[PDB]
């Protein structure tokens, strides 16, 4: 009787994480858990790479909600979701996630003395720490 | 009263994933969940990158068990674990994980017609699918 297995996914631009400043963000509407990956471009393949990670983390969802951006509605992405057996529909929860994540990234970056872009070699750990801070005790 | 929050972590070499063929593997001894990342070299920083991901995924553990490899016992890694407040001790569960993971990678690769090394552009999704298959329904 628990919540349905439905995600919302979006991309959000975060220059503190450049050059891979396109953050793909999934929120599990059941648990509120967030998965975020970084990408150098917003493409169908980026979305697919991100969901492959999100499935590794969260399991296989029944459905994913996105907007009607071309990277979500392309033949390529429609086929990839069909290959996984995931229903796709074309979002307040992921909008809130985007804000919580960008705020957390800024606080953690500034805490480490990075007032502008985060040095490339430090980004992966700082993004993972933001994800940890949003999801876990 | 649930299981203690203790991980085991190891590196295992998987040439099907070359050039980033060093797989860092954590198993949560509580749940049996596995986190795996790929690395081009086995270094203290690789271990730290891997645990940063594993914390994002699983939460912050109370302790991590490893062997006495230099990448785990270096000043750098001892300090990184202290920064996180994670107790470190210097492993059957992660050995089993290593085997389950390499077997799963081979089956999935061969299923996609890759009988030797997996093409670089396909590795990230295939590793994530192996992780998914081990952890989730």
Numbering used by the authors:
A (entry chain A), B (entry chain A): 55 to 144, 153 to 199
Copy out sentences from the published article reporting this entry, exactly as the authors wrote them.
Retroviral IN consists of three domains: the zinc-binding N-terminal domain (NTD), the catalytic core domain (CCD) and the C-terminal domain (CTD). Rous-associated virus type 1 (RAV-1) is a replication-competent alpharetrovirus, member of ASLV subgroup A; the INs of this retrovirus genus are a good model for HIV IN.
As a control, the A182T mutant of RAV-1 IN CCD (termed RAV-1 IN CCDA182T), corresponding to the RSV-A IN CCD sequence, was purified and the crystallization conditions for both RAV-1 IN CCD and RSV-A IN CCD were tested; that is, a MES buffer at pH 6.0 and a citrate buffer at pH 6.2, respectively. They belonged to space group P43212 with one molecule in the asymmetric unit. The 145–152 loop is disordered and is not observed in the electron density map, as in RSV-A IN CCD. Thus, the tertiary structure of RAV-1 IN CCD is nearly identical to that of RSV-A IN CCD, equivalent to that of RAV-1 IN CCDA182T (r.m.s. deviation of 0.4 Å on 132 Cα pairs) and respects the ribonuclease H fold. Thus, the A182T substitution influences crystal assembly via Arg179 and, either large tetragonal crystals or tiny hexagonal microcrystals are observed for RAV-1 IN CCDA182T, whereas only hexagonal crystals are obtained for RAV-1 IN CCD.
